């Protein structure tokens, strides 16, 4: 039965590939060739939020587009006010090795996680003054690579145990388990309606998941190496992923195949973080060569370079209002651009 | 407007004061990444030095070592995390010839990594007593797994323990030279390997780690403060 199942899987893959090729009537680049390019994009360091003692792995802009939270290897979770460069909060962490941080849409909670295998939800709005560890979510058996709040009670966390988990914070137990990845899941992005989410893993494959059903709706395989970044297009019908083969790739959910590749011959370092502008025209990616790139998501031509970090760029963020883009790097610096 | 901004400035002042205190505490401790495999006495090293993290203090200097054992077999993404540590303490069982090649491959991967090409490695060739027993017994031959051992002569700078069979010294220094070949093949001078012959009952590994870390910090100071 094993050989029969392998043959059936191979035939299914072949016919899926044939169907995707049939749907590939024309390329995105050819259709977008008519429109004029955006030209060079000028961006500059308005604020240099400093105070982190070690590398920053994750940041997250608030829905208010003013406050952000950053996680550093020194065991510190600093909530900055980007406008005034004043550290609103500085939460010590039980585990110094933090690789993810999230900021709730309500703004009342933040998320932390990493090598401790535990997602720590911190309540910012506490009656007794300073912040306190609200709750801890355990059940993952691999590091936590990324965290995203569905709402104040539900959080979806990707782990290096090749799984994702939907947690109800109040009960504290893993409501849903998403399984099917064969490698470490390094990033996930929530759709604007918070009904589907795409997770990128180390098996060079992204997966579109339905949170209610708990089953893998789609699987996209277009990359060559580990996927470290992923983010939905603003319309929610597409998403761009960044990988270690120095390529970003755009997939569309309905087309169910790769649409466009953002890469250059001079670029050999792998992606660490991707993001879109408010309209989605610009795709901002962070690289290992200490500099961020800003591609034209429609024409696959680089439109700008954000070279202001002395170490690896590790986290990217774009405000929901669209004012600014924040880059956090391993030089213990987080900077704001616009 | 200004009323809330003054409060925000005072809160930021308190945050920065606490953050300066935390910086003073943080820079005064040195992080070590403990690496190894099963049947290698990394746990024995930890316990004889008095889980995930173990804290020790020597010469009023505080080190805390991390043994990451809660993950799967793949190491890439969480070995990217330990790039700021002062030293990677790699423990390998010298007796087990079967897994010697696996440990050599792991050492090569750590050495040649883009984010680990600056961290020096303190190499602990643990379980020397078992290696001596294997060499003296003669049932297991190192040349079976490493044919070039049949062409290996003990280095002139070797310092064998008094009353030791030269075959055991030859085996020890052969394994050490196999690791040092990877160490010096692409070291570039930015990082170095510090091999040590340790056993289960050894009670001075903390001093070795301390001296090696002091040497690493001295070399780092020499490299950075060339222009002063």
């Amino acid at each position, epitope marked *: 039965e094993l050989d029969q199942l392998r043959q059936e899987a191979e035939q299914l893959k072949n016919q899926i590939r044939d169907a995707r090729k049939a749907c590939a009537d024309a390329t995105l680049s050819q259709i977008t060739n008519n429109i004029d390019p955006v030209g060079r994009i000028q961006m500059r360091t308005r604020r240099t939020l400093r105070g982190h003692l070690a590398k920053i792995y994750a940041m997250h802009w608030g829905t208010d587009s003013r406050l952000l939270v950053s996680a550093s290897q020194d065991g510190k979770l600093i909530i900055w006010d980007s406008y005034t460069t004043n550290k609103v909060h500085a939460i010590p962490l039980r585990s110094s090795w933090v690789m993810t941080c999230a900021y709730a849409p309500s703004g009342n909670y933040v998320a932390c996680g990493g090598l401790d295998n535990i997602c720590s939800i911190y309540n910012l709005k506490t009656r007794e003054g300073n912040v306190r560890v609200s709750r801890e979510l355990a059940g993952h058996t691999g590091r936590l690579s990324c965290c995203r709040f569905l709402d104040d009670n539900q959080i979806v966390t990707s782990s290096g145990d090749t799984t994702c988990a939907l947690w109800d914070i109040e009960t504290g137990q893993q409501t849903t388990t998403f399984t099917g990845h064969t490698g470490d899941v390094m990033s996930l992005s929530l759709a604007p309606d918070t009904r589907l989410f795409v997770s990128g893993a180390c098996d060079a494959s992204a997966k579109l998941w339905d949170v209610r059903e708990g089953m893998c709706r789609q699987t996209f395989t277009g990359h060559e190496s580990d996927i470290n970044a992923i983010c939905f297009f603003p319309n929610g019908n597409a998403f761009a992923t960044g990988s270690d083969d120095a390529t970003c790739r755009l997939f569309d959910l309905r087309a169910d195949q790769e649409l466009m590749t953002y890469s250059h011959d001079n670029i050999i370092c792998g992606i660490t973080s991707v993001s879109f502008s408010k309209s989605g025209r610009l795709l901002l990616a962070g690289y290992d060569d200490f500099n961020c790139n800003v591609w034209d998501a429609l024409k696959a031509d680089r439109a700008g370079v954000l070279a202001g970090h002395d170490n690896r760029v590790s986290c990217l963020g774009v405000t929901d209002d669209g004012m600014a883009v924040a880059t956090g790097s391993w030089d213990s610096f987080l900077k704001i651009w616009n | 407007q200004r009323n809330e901004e003054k409060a925000q400035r005072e809160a930021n002042k308190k945050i920065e004061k606490q953050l300066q205190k935390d910086k003073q505490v943080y820079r005064a401790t040195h992080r070590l990444l403990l690496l190894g495999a099963d049947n290698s006495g990394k746990s024995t090293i930890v316990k004889q030095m008095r889980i995930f993290e173990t804290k020790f203090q020597v010469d009023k200097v505080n080190f805390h070592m991390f043994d990451v054992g809660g993950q799967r077999d793949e*190491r*890439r993404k969480w070995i990217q995390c330990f790039n700021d540590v002062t030293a990677i303490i790699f423990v390998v069982d010298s007796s087990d010839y079967n897994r010697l090649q696996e440990a050599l*491959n792991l050492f090569k991967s750590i050495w*040649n990594n883009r984010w680990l090409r600056t961290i020096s490695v303190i190499l602990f060739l643990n379980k020397q007593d078992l290696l001596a027993e294997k060499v003296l017994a003669g049932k297991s031959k190192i040349e079976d797994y490493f044919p070039e051992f049949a062409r290996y002569t003990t280095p002139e700078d070797a310092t064998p323990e008094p009353g030791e069979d030269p075959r055991v010294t030859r085996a020890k220094y052969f394994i050490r030279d196999e690791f040092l070949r990877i160490s010096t093949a692409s070291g570039d001078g930015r990082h170095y390997c510090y091999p040590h012959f340790t056993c289960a009952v050894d009670t001075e590994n903390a001093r070795r780690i301390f001296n090696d870390c002091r040497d690493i910090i001295q070399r780092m100071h020499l490299r950075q403060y060339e222009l002063l």
Partner: nanobody
Amino acid sequence: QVQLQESGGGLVQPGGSLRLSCAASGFTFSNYKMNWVRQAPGKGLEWVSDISQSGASISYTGSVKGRFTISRDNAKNTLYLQMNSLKPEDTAVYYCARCPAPFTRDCFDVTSTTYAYRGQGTQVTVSS
């Protein structure tokens, strides 16, 4: 999709010869260091051989050194393992392992349970 298909192998008497071919699809072959990794019955994965991007730096496990040869044909995107002087200890399932990232000299691809970019493998049995 990153696919590695192994061809060759089978039952061979001791001292025989075999050629293991490896067709690679879904990635640029010339940008990755390649590995041959074998799993003997009753034991976990064992790294056998590896060859760099251009074939300049080949390295072997001492157990199979002097008998096995590793090679690449970047034009044909194929990896070859010339297995010579076979032994009963050399019976195993053979796999191609691509190193995780391009232009790197480090590799973590002997994962016991699941490695992302390892082939299906072919059985090579050496017995009379």
